[PDB]
Ligand binder design. Sequence first.
Ligand SMILES: Nc1ncnc2c1ncn2[C@@H]1O[C@@H]2COP(=O)(O)O[C@H]3[C@@H](O)[C@H](n4cnc5c(N)ncnc54)O[C@@H]3COP(=O)(O)O[C@H]2[C@H]1O
Ligand SMILES: [Ca+2]
Lengths: 160, 161
Amino acid sequence: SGLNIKENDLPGIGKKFEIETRSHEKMTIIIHDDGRREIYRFNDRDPDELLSNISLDDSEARQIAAILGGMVYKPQALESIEMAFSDLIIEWFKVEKGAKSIGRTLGELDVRQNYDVTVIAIIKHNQEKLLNPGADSIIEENDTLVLSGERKHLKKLIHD
Amino acid sequence: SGLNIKENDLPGIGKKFEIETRSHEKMTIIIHDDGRREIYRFNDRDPDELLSNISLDDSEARQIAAILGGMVYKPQALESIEMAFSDLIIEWFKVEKGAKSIGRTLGELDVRQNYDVTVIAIIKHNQEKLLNPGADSIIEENDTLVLSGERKHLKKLIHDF
Ligand SMILES: Nc1ncnc2c1ncn2[C@@H]1O[C@@H]2COP(=O)(O)O[C@H]3[C@@H](O)[C@H](n4cnc5c(N)ncnc54)O[C@@H]3COP(=O)(O)O[C@H]2[C@H]1O
Ligand SMILES: [Ca+2]
């Protein structure tokens, strides 16, 4: 369930992350300051044996990271997640029928000001994602809100 | 970009993404509705030859993605990026000497309202990072603002403040 990750500075070059999974599999990610990533996969039992490696530019790396991280397709069973080494909880809430928010804006609800919750995205029924909504974003039926904040504050906002 | 991506539905399982790089390297990511991911790497000249594979749970996939995506260590030389699967831009902007925004709050500057730019993080001179700042976060002398928005809007904000 829990990763082991060893990080080391590569002075003037970038950083190195050596990851070991629950499955007993090893991956090393080198991030260069110019944006290039190199990934190496090693034999579990014999880490001197390289299994595969790949180079990626900054754009490629971020696209793959968005897919892997559930930013393109979100696993349907996960309703909330908790960041490692953090209390920050991200929660996906679908506005039901007859919620008081329906038809009202982020500014009118004053979500961040009055609840300390940040709406980081809005998923429409047509499934397009609006990133960083602002005060004038209207909340509608069946829209999914992507909320970031502390659990206490999230419960409060949802309850209201 | 530089990536050929194909997405297909896997009924009762989740989704499959087949990715091919600019340099013609290929991987397949399976994303389960239960949170599990598997990643497969294949020979670029023979898609049926498996080079390696790895199995991950949701928390692991998210941590690895954050490393891969530059959210743990940022490549130092990058000043801005075109966001993945978006037309939005992310820019790192260092507030320097005599900048008129210094000592003023995001509320008072009213950045998102007036410039349609979202400050998504603030990184102080000492590399400490504040995620999703609010109206009461104060802009200070050597801060780096992590800005998100459209090209035209970013240019006006930087020019004005
Ligand atoms: N991270 C950031 N980056 C750039 N500028 C920032 C910012 N945080 C706050 N501001 C600026 O401060 C003003 C006051 O924000 P506040 O959170 O008090 O009051 C907000 C908040 O209660 C609500 N709101 C707007 N967008 C929101 C979102 N994405 N999530 C949650 N609440 C939001 O609407 C009110 C008015 O927002 P508006 O944008 O007109 O005005 C905002 C915005 O111009
Ligand atoms: Ca208000």
